[PDB]
Structures are given as structure tokens and as C-alpha cells.
Design an enzyme around this catalytic site. Structure first.
Site, PDB file in Angstrom:
ATOM      1  N   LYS A 110      42.900  68.873  12.008  1.00 25.70           N
ATOM      2  CA  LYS A 110      42.639  69.186  13.421  1.00 25.70           C
ATOM      3  C   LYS A 110      42.420  70.690  13.549  1.00 25.70           C
ATOM      4  CE  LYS A 110      43.049  68.081  17.885  1.00 25.70           C
ATOM      5  NZ  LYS A 110      41.970  67.237  18.429  1.00 25.70           N
ATOM      6  N   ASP A 235      54.222  67.368  27.165  1.00 26.92           N
ATOM      7  CA  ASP A 235      52.836  66.822  27.192  1.00 26.92           C
ATOM      8  C   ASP A 235      52.523  66.164  25.850  1.00 26.92           C
ATOM      9  OD1 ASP A 235      52.795  67.753  29.692  1.00 26.92           O
ATOM     10  OD2 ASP A 235      51.255  69.276  29.419  1.00 26.92           O
TER      11      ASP A 235
HETATM   12  C1  LIG Z   1      44.922  60.290  19.873  1.00 28.44           C
HETATM   13  C2  LIG Z   1      44.384  61.565  19.221  1.00 28.44           C
HETATM   14  C3  LIG Z   1      43.360  61.306  18.080  1.00 28.44           C
HETATM   15  N1  LIG Z   1      43.788  61.156  16.637  1.00 28.44           N
HETATM   16  C4  LIG Z   1      44.906  61.827  16.147  1.00 28.44           C
HETATM   17  C5  LIG Z   1      45.225  63.156  16.454  1.00 28.44           C
HETATM   18  C6  LIG Z   1      44.342  63.900  17.301  1.00 28.44           C
HETATM   19  N2  LIG Z   1      43.672  64.535  17.968  1.00 28.44           N
HETATM   20  C7  LIG Z   1      46.429  63.743  15.926  1.00 28.44           C
HETATM   21  C8  LIG Z   1      46.747  65.151  16.285  1.00 28.44           C
HETATM   22  C9  LIG Z   1      46.987  66.091  15.259  1.00 28.44           C
HETATM   23  C10 LIG Z   1      47.262  67.409  15.566  1.00 28.44           C
HETATM   24  C11 LIG Z   1      47.293  67.825  16.901  1.00 28.44           C
HETATM   25  C12 LIG Z   1      47.611  69.250  17.213  1.00 28.44           C
HETATM   26  C13 LIG Z   1      46.973  69.924  18.257  1.00 28.44           C
HETATM   27  C14 LIG Z   1      47.301  71.242  18.512  1.00 28.44           C
HETATM   28  C15 LIG Z   1      48.255  71.914  17.742  1.00 28.44           C
HETATM   29  C16 LIG Z   1      48.871  71.252  16.690  1.00 28.44           C
HETATM   30  C17 LIG Z   1      49.909  71.920  15.819  1.00 28.44           C
HETATM   31  C18 LIG Z   1      48.552  69.934  16.439  1.00 28.44           C
HETATM   32  F1  LIG Z   1      49.168  69.311  15.409  1.00 28.44           F
HETATM   33  C19 LIG Z   1      47.047  66.888  17.931  1.00 28.44           C
HETATM   34  C20 LIG Z   1      46.772  65.549  17.651  1.00 28.44           C
HETATM   35  N3  LIG Z   1      47.253  63.079  15.127  1.00 28.44           N
HETATM   36  C21 LIG Z   1      46.963  61.810  14.768  1.00 28.44           C
HETATM   37  C22 LIG Z   1      47.793  61.086  13.889  1.00 28.44           C
HETATM   38  N4  LIG Z   1      47.447  59.874  13.513  1.00 28.44           N
HETATM   39  C23 LIG Z   1      46.345  59.246  13.953  1.00 28.44           C
HETATM   40  C24 LIG Z   1      45.491  59.826  14.850  1.00 28.44           C
HETATM   41  C25 LIG Z   1      45.775  61.147  15.259  1.00 28.44           C
HETATM   42  C26 LIG Z   1      42.440  60.181  18.477  1.00 28.44           C
HETATM   43  O1  LIG Z   1      42.429  59.037  17.781  1.00 28.44           O
HETATM   44  O2  LIG Z   1      41.702  60.360  19.417  1.00 28.44           O
END
Ligand SMILES: CC[C@@H](Nc1c(C#N)c(-c2ccc(-c3cccc(C)c3F)cc2)nc2cnccc12)C(=O)O
Ligand SMILES: CC[C@@H](Nc1c(C#N)c(-c2ccc(-c3cccc(C)c3F)cc2)nc2cnccc12)C(=O)O
Lengths: 312, 306
Positions: A110, A235
């Protein structure tokens, strides 16, 4: 062999830098315990190739790894070998969905802001001590590495986390859950919509896990959510992926682990449905998107737990 | 492996070679080298903050000159890159120049003039190594780098050891066939292994006994090698001769794929000996007696002693 080629030069540098990082750490003592300086540490690498490897790689880039000793330790505490991690992120380009997934679907990559990076350092000591105390058994995002890339004067920060979903079992339905939020018309016309709170209620979605797993799961979530409230974070979402064994059978029949089975040391967030589920399902459920610093966090945390508890 | 050393320049060199060879494992072996490969380089600048602070310096630069060309020369000299990486990495090079821990390679600090003059000769050198199929007594140039650490900048070359990785040398000569005063100092001669010179060779009545066949093959190579050096207008090169005494002791033996400059003595030698003979120190250009003369005077002398 491995050339780290991509149409996306940022992915090329990420593959090169993770390769570099992990090989570098192979030449650095595993300490008996992390020390305060490891929470303020980095490595910066600047590459300038001239008429060398010019077809595969960009010739000019920077790669920086934040707190390499901490993230090595976190990988270990979450049961990840550095060699496997290196292979997962470099043996083939991560696929885009905005996020990327490692080619083997183990890991999420990400793009994040410098504020997010500054806020990661702010929580990093407390996050690491929490991971020690729960022996790595948590629904929290597993933060496995954190980098800054620079190529063609484009600068990004990236985080790597563990995929909530299985590396193998497909997800036919997916929810981002907060409490107190419905997918757009545009989102719902995709193959795998990210559905939300109201979609969960109005679709009459049920999750069928037995009393024991429900108790175990709500016990972790409460501890993890109270820790997030102490950090004054809010959030955040419960991500719920649903695997339908019978839909994955007919999806595949058109073209040793049994249907609806998974390795709980790889697919760590997996929970089998109970005996009396109307359909054979596997649920993948954990906390994502933690990093918003201050509803207030107390209120956010209680509403969240109250909403998740009312759906199971 | 931590690339630890008391000398921060050795740590960066060990780090650099380890990096250089890992990098080339992620780069295609081309069907042939191309002109741009003789002007190419890779620079890496490292800046660490509270990371690997005990083993390695926190701030350094490593540059490899013409990486594609030096990898091709290693292969043409019968040298695997992993074995190369291991020889220069598994343990620090020892100072006497420096020798790799397994005694396979020489590491030497050179000037930027030396670096500029290596680029000037590198196309002709490579094509010469192609045409003699690696079979030469010229220096094997195996890698060339620039290191910065603590604002200190050195250029370094890596060559194959003329001498054996196992058999000891009891006697050692730097020979040029120059008519002038070439005599090791009184200080030199007190060392355990003095670098003796032309007049020490004559005044000590030193003999090299190799059979008519090995002498012919040796002198044929030396002639072609030395005519190449003259075409490039290089001079002031030496034949380095190491003599291993078999009697001080399987004993007489060596692997000629590892110790490639080894030549057994004549059966009717009065002393069982093994000779390690090759050319070193070639990179002096005439622009700075002329190269034709140097080369002719050099061969007449080597042939005069066998
Ligand atoms: C529903 C969202 C998306 N998929 C995923 C996302 C995203 N996006 C993230 C994720 C990782 C990092 C951050 C993050 C954002 C800002 C800062 C810092 C430290 C972070 F870790 C925010 C979200 N994790 C997942 C784990 N497993 C499966 C799908 C995932 C989807 O399917 O649409
Ligand atoms: C007799 C001198 C010395 N030992 C050796 C030296 C040295 N010195 C060199 C050597 C390597 C590189 C350069 C060089 C110098 C400038 C520029 C560029 C490119 C070079 F390769 C010059 C000499 N090679 C050896 C090979 N096998 C055995 C011993 C060796 C000793 O025992 O005292």
C-alpha cells in the site's frame, strides 16, 4: 531468473529494495532484544547505473528502509521467514487491484503518506511491545516492512501487511465494517465489491461460527480495539472475506488440502463455519486501516465492538 | 558473514564485491559484449542511521567499472562468480597489496590514471583474451572498483595470484631484463621472502629447469603477450617468478585449473622444484628506451635464463 522487471518502475525499485534489504539483514546479527535506537534507525541506498542493466531496471533510484531491525523482529514474531518474505515480494511483480498483492497473495503493499510514516514511528515502540505480550496473536494489521522509493523524481512511502484473506481460497463476498456506509453504484458493479455496514444489514448477511470461536475472536478484538483506543487511533475497519466452498467448486469444475480447508499457519485469520451453517463457508476477519490519530477513540472503540458483537 | 575488518576500506570492498556479484545474478549473461559495456559502471551510495553501526561504516560509496566486461573475463579465465564472491567475502583479504584469504586473488590500490588507462586498453585486452581463449601470461583483470568511506577515495583492481593457493614459494624474482641496476635493497634482502631482481637472479646463479616442450609453449605465449603489450605501447612490466622447493616436505603436485601458472621442473633437475611464472604490472604507457625495445630486451633476457 529474477530481473525485477515491471512496466511500473516503482514496483521494480520495490522488488530490488526488498531483495536488497533482506540480503543486507542476512549480514547483520539477530539481537537478543531490540533497543530504543532501533525505533529511530534507517538504511538509505542511492543507485546510479550508467549503460548497465539499462533494459530491466531504471538507472537512477533511491530506496530507504525504516527501522529494519524492528520489522525483521515483527516478521519473526508473526511466523514469517525473511527468505519466504523475500521470495513473496521479488520472485514475481506484485499485482494491482489502491493496493497491490504479492504474486502468491500472501501480502498487501500500500502507498502511504509521510504523515502515516511519522505516525508509524509514534506508535512503533508501543505496537512492538503489544505484539510481544500477545505472542503475535492479534487481529491487528501485521506491519512487516516500511519503505521510501524515489524514481524519475516520483517519491512514495509504502507499507507491507499480511493479507487478511487466504493465499488459496477465493473470497466471493467482502465487507469493510466500522459501525455507524454502503458501497457506491460503481463499487457494486465490480466482480468483488468492497461492501459496507449497510450492505451487511440490508443483504441479510449472517456469519456462522460456533460459540467457542466467537468468544475467542471477540476476546482478541476487544483487546486489540482497547489498545488502539489507548493509542488514540480511530476510523479502523473489520475486513470480512467470505469463502463459499460450493461456489469455488463450480467456478473451478469448468476449466493435500480438502475443499473448505486452509493452513492456519499461512491463512492466520481463517475461521471455519459451524456444523449448522446453511452453506459451507470459511471467514477471514481482521482489523485494517488503523492509522488515524484523534467521535473520540473511546466512543469509536465501543461502537465498533458493539456493532461487530451484534453480527458475530 | 559480517564483512568486519579493522580497515573500513576492506569492509566496503567485501560489501562491494558481495553486492556486485549478487547484482549480476539479476542481470542476463549477454550473447556477446557491446561497446557501451566498456563505458558502463554501477555506483551505490549507502547512508545508515543506527543500523549495522558496529560491523560496517554508516556512510560509503562503491563503484564497479565495466561490470559486464569483468564478469565476461572471469568466465573466460575459468572463474565462477560464486567462488569469486566467496574468495573475496567469506573472510577479509590479508595485507602482504592484499591477498584473498584463500590466496587465489591479489587486490591492489591503483590511481585514477591507472583507471583511465585500463578503459583505454580494455577493448583490445578483452579481444586478445577472446583470441588466445584465456591462454596467456598477461595479468587476469577480474574486477575494478572505486571505494569512498570517511571522505577517503581509493581505486582497486583484482588480479589472479601468479603463485599457488597451497604450495609455498621459498624464492621470488621481479625480472625486467633492464641493463640498469636492478638489485633488491639490503632492507628487502632481510625479509623472509625478499622480492629479488635481475642482478640477484644472475649473481645467485639461479636456474629454472623446465623440459624443451613446456619452455617452447611458455616462450611462444610470452612472445605473443609481449608483442600485444608493445602494440598497446605499454612497458615497465616484469616477469614474476616464484620457486617452490618440493624437497622441503601430494608433495610435488598442484591443480593446473587453480594454479594455472605452475610448471613442473625437468626430470633431470638437480632439485625438485615447481615454477610459477607470469607477467605483472603492465599499465605504464609510453606517453608519460621505447616499447619495441623494452619488449625485445625483456624476451631476450627471459629466453637467456629459460
Ligand atoms: C478494504 C481495503 C482494500 N484491501 C486491503 C487493504 C487496503 N487498502 C489493506 C490496507 C493496508 C494498509 C493500509 C494503510 C493505510 C495507511 C497507513 C498504513 C500504515 C496502512 F497500513 C490500509 C489498508 N489491507 C488489506 C488486508 N487484507 C486484504 C485486503 C486489504 C480493498 O480490498 O479495497
Ligand atoms: C611483485 C609485486 C608484489 N606482488 C604482486 C603484485 C603486486 N604489487 C601484483 C600486482 C597486481 C596489480 C598491479 C597493478 C598496478 C597498477 C595498475 C594496475 C591495473 C595493476 F594491476 C601491480 C602488481 N600481482 C601479483 C600477482 N601474483 C603474485 C604477486 C603479485 C610483491 O610480491 O611484492
Amino acid at each position: 531468473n529474477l530481473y525485477f522487471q515491471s512496466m511500473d518502475p516503482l514496483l521494480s525499485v520495490l522488488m530490488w529494495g526488498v531483495n536488497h534489504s533482506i540480503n543486507e539483514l542476512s549480514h547483520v546479527q539477530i539481537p537478543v532484544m531490540l533497543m530504543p535506537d532501533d525505533f529511530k534507525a534507517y538504511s538509505k541506498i542511492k543507485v546510479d547505473n550508467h549503460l548497465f542493466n539499462k533494459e530491466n531496471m531504471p538507472s537512477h533510484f533511491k530506496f530507504k528502509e525504516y527501522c529494519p531491525m524492528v520489522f525483521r523482529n515483527l516478521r519473526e514474531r508473526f511466523g514469517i521467514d525473511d527468505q519466504d518474505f523475500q521470495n513473496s515480494l521479488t520472485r514475481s511483480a506484485p499485482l494491482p487491484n489502491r493496493f497491490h498483492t504479492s504474486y502468491d497473495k500472501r501480502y498487501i503493499i500500500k502507498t502511504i503518506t509521510s504523515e502515516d510514516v511519522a505516525e508509524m514511528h509514534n506508535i512503533l515502540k508501543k505496537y512492538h511491545q503489544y505484539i510481544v505480550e500477545c505472542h503475535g496473536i492479534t487481529l491487528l494489521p501485521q506491519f512487516l516492512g516500511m519503505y521510501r522509493l524515489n524514481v524519475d523524481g516520483v517519491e512514495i512511502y509504502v507499507i507491507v501487511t499480511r493479507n487478511v484473506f487466504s493465499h488459496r481460497l477465493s473470497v466471493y463476498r467482502k465487507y469493510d465494517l466500522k459501525g455507524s456506509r454502503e458501497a457506491s453504484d460503481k463499487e457494486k458493479a465490480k466482480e468483488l465489491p468492497t461492501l459496507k455496514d449497510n450492505d451487511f444489514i440490508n443483504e441479510g448477511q449472517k456469519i456462522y461460527i460456533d460459540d467457542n470461536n466467537k468468544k475467542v475472536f471477540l476476546e482478541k478484538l476487544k483487546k486489540d480495539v482497547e489498545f488502539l483506543a489507548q493509542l488514540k487511533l480511530m476510523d479502523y475497519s473489520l475486513l470480512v472475506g467470505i469463502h463459499d466452498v460450493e461456489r469455488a467448486e463450480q467456478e473451478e469444475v469448468e476449466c493435500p488440502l480438502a475443499p473448505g480447508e486452509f493452513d492456519p499457519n499461512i491463512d492466520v485469520y481463517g475461521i471455519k463455519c459451524h456444523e449448522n451453517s446453511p452453506r459451507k463457508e470459511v471467514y477471514f476477519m481482521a482489523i485494517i486501516d488503523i492509522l488515524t490519530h484523534y467521535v473520540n477513540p473511546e466512543q469509536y472503540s465501543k461502537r465498533f465492538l458493539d456493532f461487530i458483537g451484534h453480527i458475530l
